[PDB]
């Protein structure tokens, strides 16, 4: 491969290491990283010359047809709009224009350019129209290019490097070498052809270059001109090329994707063109697979347990597939082909359909094909001008087909109107439901509990926030002089900052401020319009409390919130799998825009009236959250009007209804556009975070229930449909979360419902939603779409396109981040490639290349010095990336499921133990006195020679700079503290409780001499945590950066030869692997697409353990003792301390002090303390006391039973008696089991039984040291 010869020497070495030829070393690790940072990026394109492509792809010159930008922008009413070219009002995206004329030249790199300083000045100072339009166009065009985790060229360099040389085979019988090869990929050939336009003297000038402040462009010569779309096309091509290789797809499918992108790029508005024909691929493949005759195969047999509210499922065998079970819904070929005819891409459909017809039976190949084809959709984070986005989304109002007549209301109650009893229909149903819930909320001593009140107030504060300026204005307007703490370096717009200002003020004085402006933000998306973030101010968030509370009660006490408890997201996995099984018919539904359709004229007025009436049952004089009862005029009786008191809850409703009727008033201040901030109101619900899911899920459930039980039976025609539609209820037939929803039909007896009845049913539902202005957007394709998860016949399909390898969202014109953060990006990037099942061997190779580039970085003072550093590669091992090849071992023996942290280290060393010991003896002189785990052979020196300690400690170092304090600012720190504590401790009982607990605790901890300095979670530190978070949200000063680099280097250079005490002790255990465990399911049945004999290790791991989490006796430790806690503190810290105390045998008052330290009253403290026992605790619950946790990668596997009865901590016939844990086994055995299973999961291949065989020291010695360490911390 001449390309391998083209690489420079260090990169050739790195490629050899990645191929598994040689063990990786820090030396070559640096040489590769360094040289990448010094050579120009264009050379990566230069590498493409040495690929003899043989693919049938032609790049039409139609691409280079820049449409003039001047006609794509205009300003009216002093705002820069997009003025769409086509008559479609949605063409509001970046056009296809030549950016060239707007460029100057840089002094550093003369070839590339940036915006004219003249243009931006005139747009800023003169507000000149054309200047502003040019600026806006330049800003957004640059931003669209910036939507990548790093420069795409670097990723392309990674792909070439790994693909430059075939990987060496391992000894495994399932290690199939790659079937795909270069010179056959249409993507790379396409990149070659298109890039031929950008060379002048064989130099291959990149069309653009991304920088921290955005992206720069190259000035074209007089002959040529660069269209911004080309850059986007390159990114899509590179992303597709990487994905195709990792997914190992046929070149034909990649060919179709290339043609797909080219056609989109040829026309104007590359983004808009792609967006229009988005769903073509899933419709062609996923929605229509088995609509033929030769159907068959094996399918999972999943059963839903009787208490369906618990969402518990059981795998109970397999089911043979046959024609009677084949999908009933019509295919999707006709509409898709009709759409494709518009863009004359019918060939793509013909190719896809013909290829699809080669999979008549459901098996691994079929789903693998589906996974690959669905991976063809564009992975670009689309971005448009926020001004257009806000103008296009919130300009919608629902259309009600039968409005509530005005005569249907009673007389006013000051603001609200009650609903007349004579009114029926869905509105009546909605009214009663909310009213009933309001009644239940009304009398509930759960509130007025001071602890619960603390939870609600604390829930309102986060590091982020907004609308602070509106807050300061509104209160200053009403004569309220708020405090300030600027010297305490914390952002004013933080929700924390405004909360501190409010602490002292009597609440009712603030009531006028709730009718104030709210700022807004935008977050871009991959396959849809960008999302919206609308953070209310703290006061508004407080007022809306009743709305949330009632919604919560509706959810938690009707359909159990339809999984909106979100305890572990994986509970939806078995649900959709069950929903997609052949015996069941499922329908996917979701509100078209629930945020935009909920409104006051129809919905909120009804809810407000119901809540206000529902609160009538209760003491009319009972203040709630500092809101006192007031007098309101009642005008229900025209003959006898009067005024009566109303409780604080009702007063809240009175104002809340007023606000909703007035409509939200937003203020847009987009930065990408130029000087165009303004404010306009809308009825669109905020819906900026999970706090909105409760309301929409409640209304979603309510309307669905009424439709099923009342509207549909009264209106449908088919008698058979009526027969099956009856005996159906939401609690066992429907789930939802926000707009999203799933509806599944009762099992038709050995049969399926007529599509005719389905059409009748679906039609009526659409009309039902049309009544009150909900577009239901339903579909029926015998698949499962819920929370962006896809299941087909009980097999999960990872939609990889939603996690593009290169793409990353950036919501601001500047990246605003520092170099070390890139490491965390790499770690998160790699995990997705594990969550989604890719070719695990090749994905690992690519990951290391990414890591190598990220391993190095530098910084420069605003005026002064530069700084630099880089990590030894062992860091990434500690961070959770398996090594490819260790010295003395064979490559590719470590599975991706290897746990991060100490566990991964221990497992690696445990396997590597014997070779290290023997090799150290030959190579080095013995150490001077005996070692606990090692002999005299002195492996630690060898590890230092490998730089293991350097990497091990380097990964421990922090990666974000720290802000500095000040003393007059500390007066503000105290002022900030005092007020935060004041806001937290509204009453006095909590303060007395915490103070008593803290005083007793330190007294006990010192006098009993457990230890001193134990940072125990307590409420007094919660404000401190808030303050630190608030100060951290600020951009750090350069001095902090310099401290980081210096500290990091010193930590790297310091010669240390010891791990943490825990890892040192963990090495004392010897673990061995026996035979394979009995299988969970039939290996024939596919469960996750791509986890097949080709991708062996995933296929092994899933097959052995089974995917369905089925903790019938374990419950994965979710039964934490402290169900109710305040924000800021960590439950996982609290229970760990409690168990640690219990193991240490502390006296009960120690528990009492600790519990009282977090607000628990003495009585409940005793009650809680009594529950603490080593028996009822779960394996993971107790094992976490020493930070032994379950890796996130395991959350999709049924590891419970294995850990329970497959990891033998003491097998009688194998273990040495020295390792017998004896009585301490009650808390020793879980630790050993966790270590054992971690090692077993580390190695590749099938899961084997794990057995402790020996502890070098006695088990007693191990337990004693552990108790010491537990007492120390």
């Amino acid at each position: 491969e001449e390309l391998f010869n083209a690489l420079p020497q260090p990169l050739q070495q790195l490629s050899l290491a990645l191929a598994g030829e040689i063990p990786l070393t820090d030396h070559i690790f640096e040489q590769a990283a360094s040289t990448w940072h010094v050579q120009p990026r264009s050379l990566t394109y230069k590498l493409l010359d040495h690929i003899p492509f043989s693919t049938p792809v032609v790049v039409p010159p139609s691409i280079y047809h820049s449409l003039d930008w001047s006609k794509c922008f205009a300003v009216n009413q002093d705002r820069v709009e997009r003025v769409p070219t086509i008559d479609d009002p949605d063409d509001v995206y970046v056009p296809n224009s030549d950016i060239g004329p707007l460029l100057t030249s840089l002094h550093t790199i003369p070839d590339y350019g940036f915006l004219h300083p003249a243009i931006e000045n005139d747009a800023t100072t003169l507000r000149a129209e054309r200047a502003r339009c040019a600026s806006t166009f330049y800003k957004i065009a640059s931003s669209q290019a910036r939507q990548v985790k790093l420069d795409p060229i670097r990723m392309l360099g990674f792909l070439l490097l790994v693909q430059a040389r075939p990987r060496v085979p391992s000894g495994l019988v399932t290690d199939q070498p790659t079937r795909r090869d270069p010179t056959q990929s249409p993507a790379l050939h396409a990149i070659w052809q298109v890039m031929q336009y950008y060379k002048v003297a064989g130099v291959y000038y990149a069309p653009a270059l991304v920088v921290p402040s955005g992206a720069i462009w190259w000035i074209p010569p007089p002959g040529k001109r660069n269209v911004v779309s080309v850059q986007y096309l390159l990114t899509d091509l590179i992303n597709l090329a990487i994905l195709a290789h990792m997914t190992d797809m046929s070149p034909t499918l990649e060919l179709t994707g290339v043609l797909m992108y080219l056609r989109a790029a040829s026309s104007h508005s590359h983004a808009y063109t792609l967006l229009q024909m988005k769903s073509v691929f899933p419709a062609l493949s996923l929605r229509s697979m088995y609509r033929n005759k030769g159907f068959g195969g094996k399918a999972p047999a999943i059963e839903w347990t009787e208490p369906r509210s618990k969402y518990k499922f059981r795998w109970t065998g397999v089911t043979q597939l046959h024609d009677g079970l084949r999908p009933r819904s019509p295919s999707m070929d006709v509409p898709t082909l009709e759409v494709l005819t518009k863009y004359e891409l019918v060939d793509i459909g013909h190719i896809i359909i013909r290829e699809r017809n080669a999979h008549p039976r459901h098996n691994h190949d079929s789903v693998r094909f589906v996974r690959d084809v669905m991976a063809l959709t564009s992975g670009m984070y689309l971005v448009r001008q926020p001004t257009m986005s806000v103008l296009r989304e919130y300009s919608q109002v629902p259309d009600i087909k039968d409005p509530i007549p005005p005569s249907a209301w009673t007389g006013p109650i000051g603001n609200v109107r009650y609903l007349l009893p004579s009114v029926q229909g869905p509105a009546r149903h909605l009214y009663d439901t909310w009213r009933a819930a309001a009644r239940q909320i009304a009398q509930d001593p759960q509130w007025h509990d001071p602890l619960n009140q603390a939870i609600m107030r604390a829930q309102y504060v986060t590091a982020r926030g907004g609308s602070s300026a509106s807050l300061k204005f509104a209160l200053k307007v009403t004569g309220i002089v708020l405090p300030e703490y600027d010297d305490s370096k914390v952002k004013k717009s933080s929700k924390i900052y405004q909360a501190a200002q409010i602490a002292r003020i009597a609440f009712m004085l603030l009531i006028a401020a709730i009718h104030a402006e709210v700022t807004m933000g935008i977050r871009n998306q991959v396959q849809r319009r960008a999302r919206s973030i609308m953070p209310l101010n703290v006061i508004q968030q407080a007022i809306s409390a009743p709305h949330t509370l009632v919604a919560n009660y509706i959810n938690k006490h009707m359909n159990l919130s339809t999984t909106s408890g979100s305890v572990v997201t994986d509970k939806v996995i078995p649900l959709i799998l069950y929903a997609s099984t052949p015996p069941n018919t499922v329908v996917n539904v979701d509100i078209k825009a629930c945020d935009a359709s909920i409104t006051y004229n129809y919905f909120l007025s009804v809810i407000c009236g119901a809540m206000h009436e529902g609160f009538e049952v209760g003491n009319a004089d009972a203040a709630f959250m500092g809101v006192p009862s007031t007098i309101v005029s009642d005008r229900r009786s025209s003959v006898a009007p009067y005024s009566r008191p109303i409780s604080g809850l009702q007063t809240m409703v009175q104002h809340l209804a007023d606000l909703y009727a007035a409509g939200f008033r937003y203020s847009v201040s987009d930065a990408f556009s130029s000087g165009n901030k303004f404010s306009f109101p809308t009825s669109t619900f905020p819906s900026g975070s999970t706090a909105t899911s409760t309301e929409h899920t409640a209304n979603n459930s309510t309307m669905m229930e009424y439709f099923l039980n009342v509207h549909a039976p009264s209106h449908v025609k088919s008698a058979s449909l009526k027969r099956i539609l009856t005996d159906m209820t939401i609690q066992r037939n429907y789930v939802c979360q926000g707009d999203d929803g799933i509806l599944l039909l009762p099992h038709e007896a050995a049969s399926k419902i007529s599509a005719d009845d389905m059409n009748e049913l679906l039609t009526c539902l659409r009309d039902y939603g049309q009544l009150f202005g909900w577009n239901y957007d339903i579909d029926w394709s015998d698949t499962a779409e819920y929370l962006k998860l896809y299941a087909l016949m009980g097999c999960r399909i990872p939609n990889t396109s939603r996690h593009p390898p290169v793409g990353k969202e950036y919501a601001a014109p500047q990246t605003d981040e520092i170099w070390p953060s890139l490491i965390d990006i790499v770690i998160g990037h790699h995990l997705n490639g594990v969550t989604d099942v890719l070719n695990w061997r090749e994905w690992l190779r690519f990951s290391w290349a990414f890591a190598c580039y990220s391993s190095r970085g530098g910084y420069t003072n605003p005026k002064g010095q530069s700084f630099s550093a880089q990590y030894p590669w062992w860091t990434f091992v500690y961070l959770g990336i398996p090594p490819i090849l260790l010295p003395g071992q064979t490559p590719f023996i470590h599975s991706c499921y290897m746990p991060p942290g100490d566990q991964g280290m221990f497992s690696i060393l445990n396997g590597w133990r014997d070779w290290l010991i023997s090799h150290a003896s030959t190579t080095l002189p013995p150490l001077r006195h005996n070692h606990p785990v090692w002999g005299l052979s002195d492996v630690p020196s060898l590890l230092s020679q490998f730089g293991v300690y350097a990497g091990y400690h380097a990964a421990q170092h922090y990666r974000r700079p720290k802000p500095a304090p000040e003393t007059a600012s500390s007066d503000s720190i105290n002022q900030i503290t005092s007020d935060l504590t004041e806001y937290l401790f509204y009453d006095s009982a909590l303060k007395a409780r915490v103070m008593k607990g803290r005083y007793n605790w330190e007294r006990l901890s010192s006098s009993l001499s457990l230890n001193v300095g134990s940072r125990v979670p307590s409420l007094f530190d919660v404000p401190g945590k808030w303050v630190a978070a608030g100060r951290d949200a600020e951009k750090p000063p350069p001095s902090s950066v310099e401290d980081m680099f210096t500290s990091l280097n010193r930590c790297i250079r310091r010669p240390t030869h010891s791990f943490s005490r825990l890892l040192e002790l963990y090495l004392r255990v010897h673990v061995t692997l026996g035979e394979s465990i009995p299988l969970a399911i039939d290996p024939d049945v596919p469960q996750v697409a791509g986890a097949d004999p080709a991708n062996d290790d995933h296929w092994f791991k899933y097959t052995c353990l089974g995917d369905i989490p089925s903790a019938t006796r374990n419950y994965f430790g979710e039964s934490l003792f402290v169900g109710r806690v305040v924000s800021g503190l960590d439950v996982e810290a609290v229970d760990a301390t409690l168990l640690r105390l219990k193991i240490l045998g502390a006296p009960p008052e120690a528990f009492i002090a600790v519990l009282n330290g977090i607000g628990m009253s003495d009585s409940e403290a005793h009650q809680i303390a009594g529950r603490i026992s080593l028996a009822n605790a779960q394996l993971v619950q107790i094992a976490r006391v020493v930070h032994l946790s379950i890796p996130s990668s395991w959350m999709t596997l049924n590891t419970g039973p294995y850990i329970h009865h497959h990891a033998y901590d003491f097998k009688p016939g194998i273990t040495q008696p020295s390792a017998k844990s004896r009585d301490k086994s009650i808390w020793m055995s879980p630790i050993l089991k966790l270590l054992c299973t971690s090692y077993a999961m580390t190695v590749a291949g099938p899961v084997r039984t794990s057995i402790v065989t020996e502890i070098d020291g006695s088990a007693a010695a191990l337990s004693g040291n552990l108790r010491v360490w537990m007492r120390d911390v």
Binding site: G296, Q320, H322, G324
Partner: protein, 50 residues
């Protein structure tokens, strides 16, 4: 899958074709002119008539 699909659904038609109906003539023997009669136009006129 063929056998399983066959054994599970009996609505595969393939029933014997019982109903066949005739509206013509219930006969199976045809009277046939084997040797045509000669046409006479000069001598023996009138001995045959068509």
């Amino acid at each position: 899958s063929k056998h399983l699909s066959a054994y599970l659904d009996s609505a595969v038609a393939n029933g014997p074709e019982l109903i066949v109906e005739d509206t013509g003539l219930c006969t199976s023997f045809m009277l046939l002119d084997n040797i045509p009669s000669a046409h006479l136009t000069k001598e023996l006129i009138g001995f045959t008539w068509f």
